[PDB]
C-alpha cells in the first residue's frame, strides 16, 4: 500500500535512464523509490544495470524505453527473462511516484472528486427553504409596478397624444447636468 | 453567493473535463469501502425520505389541525359553492352581472 506517497526522485536519482533507474534505486535517499528494491545488492559492486532485469534483482528497472523525463520505474524481477511485475513508478512523470495502474484509479479519483462537489451541491440546495401548503406555507416587484386597473376606452387620449410632438417639435436635450 | 457558487461549479466542471481530455490524449483486504459508501447512501436516502415526510406533514397540515382561512381548497369553494362555478378568462371566475336575466348591458 505504498503508492499513495507523492514523493519524488531528486538526487537519489542522479539519472532516471534505462539502467540509470536501477542505480538510482540502488541509492534510496531519501525519496526516489523503495528502500525495499534490490538497491543494496545492486550497489554491492557498482552503480549498474544488472539488478534491473538481467540478474535476478528487484530494482527500478527499464520496464520500457523512456530517456526524456524518467523511465517507467517497475520493480522488475523475474527468474526468467522478459517480465516486470508492477506496483508503482519512480518516474518523474506527474512529478511523483504514483500507483502505475491503469485508468481505473485515475477516473475513479476523478469521480470521487466530482462527487465531493456533488454532495456539496445536494446539501447546498437542501435546506435553503421548501415549498409547503403554500410554497413554504409558513408564518401566517409584487405590490405594484406600472398600473393595475389602467383600462383603455378613453385611451383615446393616446389617440390625441398622437398629435403633440406634431402640434409642436421636441427640443434637443444632450445635457445631463 | 449565487454567482460565486455558479462560477465554482463551472470551474470544477472545466477542471474535470480538462483532466479527462488530458488522460485520454495521454492514453492514446478488510477495507470494505463499497460497504461504507452503500451505508452512507442508505443513510442519505432515509434522511431525504424523512425530510420529505416532514415537508408533507408540516406544509399541508393546515386544514388537518383546524379549519382556518386558506384559499387552498378551503376558502375559494365557500364563495364559489355560494355564488358561481369554475370559469377562467385569465383568473376570473363567475362575475356577478345578473346576465342570466339582465339583457341590459354587460
Amino acid at each position: 500500500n505504498l503508492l499513495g506517497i507523492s514523493w519524488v526522485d531528486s538526487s537519489w536519482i542522479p539519472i532516471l535512464n534505462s539502467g540509470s533507474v536501477l542505480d538510482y534505486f540502488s541509492e534510496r535517499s531519501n525519496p526516489f523509490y523503495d528502500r525495499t528494491c534490490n538497491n543494496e545488492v545492486v550497489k554491492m559492486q557498482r552503480l549498474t544495470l544488472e539488478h534491473l532485469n538481467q540478474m535476478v534483482g528487484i530494482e527500478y528497472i527499464l520496464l520500457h524505453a523512456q530517456e526524456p523525463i524518467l523511465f517507467i520505474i517497475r520493480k522488475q524481477q523475474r527468474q526468467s527473462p522478459a517480465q516486470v511485475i508492477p506496483l508503482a513508478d519512480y518516474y518523474i512523470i506527474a512529478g511523483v511516484i504514483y500507483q502505475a495502474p491503469d485508468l481505473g484509479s485515475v477516473i475513479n479519483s476523478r469521480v470521487l472528486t466530482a462527487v465531493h462537489g456533488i454532495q456539496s451541491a445536494f446539501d447546498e440546495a437542501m435546506s435553503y427553504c421548501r415549498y409547503h401548503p403554500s410554497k413554504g406555507y409558513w408564518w401566517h416587484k409584487a405590490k405594484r409596478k406600472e398600473e393595475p386597473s389602467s383600462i383603455f376606452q378613453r385611451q383615446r387620449v393616446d389617440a390625441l397624444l398622437l398629435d403633440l410632438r406634431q402640434k409642436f417639435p421636441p427640443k434637443f436635450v444632450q445635457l445631463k447636468p | 453567493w449565487p454567482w460565486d457558487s455558479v462560477r465554482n461549479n463551472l470551474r470544477s466542471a472545466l477542471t474535470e473535463m480538462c483532466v479527462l481530455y488530458d488522460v485520454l490524449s495521454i492514453v492514446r483486504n478488510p477495507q470494505t469501502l463499497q460497504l461504507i459508501s452503500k451505508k452512507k447512501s442508505l443513510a442519505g436516502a432515509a434522511q431525504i425520505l424523512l425530510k420529505g415526510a416532514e415537508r408533507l406533514t408540516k406544509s399541508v397540515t393546515e386544514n388537518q389541525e383546524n379549519k382556518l382561512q386558506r384559499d387552498f381548497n378551503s376558502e375559494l369553494l365557500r364563495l364559489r359553492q355560494h355564488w358561481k362555478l369554475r370559469k377562467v378568462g385569465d383568473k376570473i371566475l363567475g362575475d356577478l352581472s345578473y346576465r342570466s336575466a339582465g339583457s341590459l348591458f354587460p
Binding site: 406600472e146 398600473e147 386597473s149 389602467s150 383600462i151 383603455f152 385611451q155 393616446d158 397624444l161 398622437l162 403633440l164 410632438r165 421636441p170 434637443f172 436635450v173 444632450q174 445631463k176 | 378568462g89 385569465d90 376570473i92
Partner: peptide, 24 residues
C-alpha cells in the same frame, strides 16, 4: 432617476398602460 438621462431618440408618445381584464 439620475445616471445621465441622455434618452433622446424620438417617439415620445406610445402609451405604456395596461387594463386587459374584461374578456378582450
Amino acid at each position: 432617476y439620475y445616471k445621465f438621462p441622455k434618452k433622446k431618440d424620438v417617439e415620445f408618445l406610445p402609451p405604456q398602460l395596461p387594463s386587459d381584464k374584461f374578456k378582450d
